[PDB]
Design a protein around this nucleic acid. Sequence first.
DNA 1: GACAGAAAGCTCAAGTACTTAAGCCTGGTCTTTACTA
Length: 49
Amino acid sequence: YNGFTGRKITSQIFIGPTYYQRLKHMVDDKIHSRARGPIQILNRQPMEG
DNA sequence: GACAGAAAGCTCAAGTACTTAAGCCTGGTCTTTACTA
């Protein structure tokens, strides 16, 4: 049944329990932004990493 | 003066030196100086 309106769904959906894994990769460890931060010593260019 | 031989020359196959080798990103760990003097 549709969660929003309560109407039945015309197609019949395949459902069941399946074993799922959470992986090490998370967005909080990958999100990054830069604006006039640290400057490399030799090239006077933005840092790496 | 006509031939042949010995010449410098020239070109053409093998061998050698040198080059590049995807893009971005995240971590971790280790180490710069150990050894003779």
